[model samples]
Target: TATVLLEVPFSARGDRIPDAVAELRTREPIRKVRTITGAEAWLVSSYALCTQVLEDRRFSMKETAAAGAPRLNALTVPPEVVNNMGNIADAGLRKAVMKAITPKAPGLEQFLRDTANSLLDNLITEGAPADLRNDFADPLATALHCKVLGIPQEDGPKLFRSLSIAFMSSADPIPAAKINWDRDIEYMAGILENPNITTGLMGELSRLRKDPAYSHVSDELFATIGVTFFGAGVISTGSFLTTALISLIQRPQLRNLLHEKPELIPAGVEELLRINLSFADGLPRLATADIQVGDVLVRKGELVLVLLEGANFDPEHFPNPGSIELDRPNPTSHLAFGRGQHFCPGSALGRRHAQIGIEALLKKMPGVDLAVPIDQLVWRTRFQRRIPERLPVLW
Candidate 1:
């Protein structure tokens, strides 16, 4: 075992990667570190090494979440269960979700904007001094998750509430999260059985269920679909939305530049994503075979977590990666959504949400500004996400 240099998720002072990660990129690209769970694992910190770990099949998320795997946390379910969900059998479901969420889907952008504006209208009705996180960001993400998963809009509020508890911070006891987990799955199963849910992602998923390739799929997998959509898609996109909003708020010039040009919003969104800081711990992957990562020897079954944020800010790949270069020719090159087959299928959806949501908010409330000093805003410290407890804003 290598010496434990530093405990991970080195605290972030602000929006950039912690200085420690930047420092370690050269000092120890593949440093062995102690996880909160007291497990020893390799923390891959450089851009090239991180990319290799993500793209190489030798590193498997499947086994990493399995029984006896050195997880970043303990007290989790066995493999093939929720949270430790099986992926190979979920391909059909993944395809269905991607089909509905991708920006390329017909009327997707329209539906997104409509939902966003409707939520903004509700926020407006409540007047100024609003918590954009609860009033706009969270609900908007919930609405889109519902739209993509065939969950009724009316049930969105409750569903969002349930999943919030179910996906409580990793700091919460496993059993506590499991209780809320059951409630969420039960609610989803109810919707799947109801006749009223004839369209949306559920429709496609139902059709795919009959396909021979996925014929062995179980209700558990269906529950995983629901969990993944609301649980996975919601928070990450919401975090991105919040971070992007805060960044824009800090630099009124960038907001105005986007508003005046409009066309630059897409590129601006990319840069924002590149630096969308997340204090969440690195992604956990288990090696399936011996592989060389930087100067370390990662043997089969060893835990190797990839620091995507570290990769994103690696100056070798991103010149002055610390700064927000809106028009960086290769804005899409960042690994914010991950890499290879495990790359987030919801990436386009998240990017579009950031692009369209910000544009809509600006167009409607051009004079909007932060309600309090940036340093005064309260942030949550969760292993799975980085988000403010509330984003207060005024117009």
Candidate 2:
């Protein structure tokens, strides 16, 4: 009998985890599947196996960019950039990059709170049926990233505009992606030389650009860092927050609980993060050596995809996995920010963004609910994050 390869990424809707995920986790925790790019890969779904794949560096993320390697999706970046963190560490910028992204930077939390309040105030003043995605979540993400990158806030929209192409998970290399990539690189290179840029990550990068000790680093690497950081941070925070707001709005009991006791906002946000369907596709890795994952041996150079929702929604690991239980013993165990070598550096900032955004939103719009029917909101497809195009809400 010919083997049947099930298509991966079962759903793109932001509101629900696909039932197929749980079914697959139960029937075949690790099985061969085909990605959008028509590449066959071992899909690791169960919590135990997914953790094993991620924690074992032998399942390599950097090697996934190797020439002729099967891909999960077309590269939106230059091949070298697929190994972005590795390159950052190679250039000796890892510490600086890590320090720069810390959420506790002086006045950062206040800035977030202020920004969230201002966005909510704007939405409230604008009247009902406000688009929380574009009007609030995206703008807040753009503003926060602009502040973090030390770029002029006015310049954010142009950079933000590039992301629709820049973050596409497509079947083939997107022409516009390269155009925007080169243009954004030029923009970042200019920012490094801009004397007016004197704070935040790019400011520190700008100063480091002049340091004799770091003179060996290429301008391209520095510019790449700026562009990638801004794009990734903004897209991630905005998408997660948008979907999270939907999750909260759909569950009035939990929303009211968090609103009445704002202190639970952090826990609520963690639960929200666990349940979020932000990543539209499985996280990809390439095997560097033959490794037994459950019943299958993933050969050297073979592609592997860690299906996060599969692990997250595994009933064995997270009992009643679909429900958002704030007090779960393993609240932070989900691979939402991922795990292992390439764990998300923007995680802290992302968590803070959602927490502050939700807190301020509840305070400002205590009766907030979706203005449109749940199915009426159009979900984005062939994109890096799972989110609605416009999150229309009313209070």
Candidate 3:
């Protein structure tokens, strides 16, 4: 088996494919590569092909979350969560989650300001040269997750610790996955069953139970929606927050330019999202029937995973494929949030939340600098999320 040490050292290797992803996209957007686990599946790159495959009804998220998902060592999630995540593909339900998160976008600026100051307060107490990942990103993310879900802030990290590793980090995540999945769904289910429910997503779910038209959903269905939204909400925000800072540090000129011209930050956020520092492995799609995409024929039953880095950097679609353009046209169209029917329902909130977090970081400590070189940071290895294990910095 080929050892792909998915770490910064390996990413810096000379023999490594320059424009590693673009070369893959230009040559063949949907090539096959056995992951470290030796499971083979189609890797979808190229904006054209990635979005094309998205709207098609042939693919299903259910199979991807199924027991022993390809490339994954084990099935960590319970059957109920698996089914709920699959049901997330339902368009009507997506609207519900979007509605819950969208209105909250207004108050996010306040949260970002509060959360950053609070986390940075802790960082200052720890003194300089603190790891941003653990000190800033982790704490901030946990608090944000808790705040958005209306969970108690004091209990945030405990829940986050149990939640992330269980579903995404463990070598064999199935067991942890099952527990977190059940915990989240059951927790929400309790809120729904509570006699004195006020308002919120859970309350809405309960309200739906009173409507005959929507009441047909079983406890399983309620759990499914809860688990799916919670899962997507937690990890996605963490990635955006950490990666945005990484990109900022990597491009200091742009950082300074935007800092001086804060108005341009909105457009700048789009660019960062498009060229995220962490390369997404891909969005997996299961083909139901034979299809041809740009002279390549995809056979039925073959799973397809869209490589976001490749598609986002494709030269044909994006000029100067390797470079990050701050004002790339139609930047929001980027697939950092995916595309088509199953595009992230929580994206509107995610983008707004990220922008708010970044704004706070800059305004509070405009001179913040990376304490150690990027080379020294501990990059996470063999994990789903590409994060610096610790992002220490000084201002």
Which candidate leads the pack in lDDT? 2
Q: Identify the superior model by TM-score, candidate 1 or candidate 2.
A: 2
Local accuracy of candidate 3 as per-residue lDDT tens digits, 1-395: 89852322124211112456676677877776655455667777788888788777676655666545564334456544544534543524655655766627456558766888887777778778877667776677666655555445675665566544643533354555556766766766775677655444555666776778665567767756655565567667776678678778667787788778888888888887877745435666666778887666877666677767667777777787556677677667778877776677777777776777677677765777888866776656554566766777787
Error of 3 at 331 (Å): 1.6
What candidate 2 gets wrong by more than 4 Å, as runs, is 1-4
lDDT of 3 at 161: 67
2 or 3: which has the higher TM-score? 2
**Which ten contiguous residues of candidate 2 have the minimum total lDDT?**
3-12
Q: Indicate whether candidate 1 or candidate 2 has the larger lDDT.
A: 2
Question: Number of clashing pairs, model 3?
Answer: 6
lDDT per residue (tens digit) for residues 56-168 in model 2: 99999888888899999998899899889999999899999988887878998899889889888888888998999999999999999998988999999999999988988
For candidate 2, the per-residue lDDT at 258 reads 97
TM-score of each: 0.91, 0.98, 0.86
Count backbone clashes in candidate 1: 0
Q: Which ten-residue region of model 3 has the weakest summed lDDT?
A: 7-16
TM-score of 3: 0.86
Model 3 gets an lDDT of 0.65
lDDT of 1 at 175: 72
- Runs in model 1 with CA error above 4 Å? 1-5, 12-14, 75-78, 81-94, 168-173, 210-215
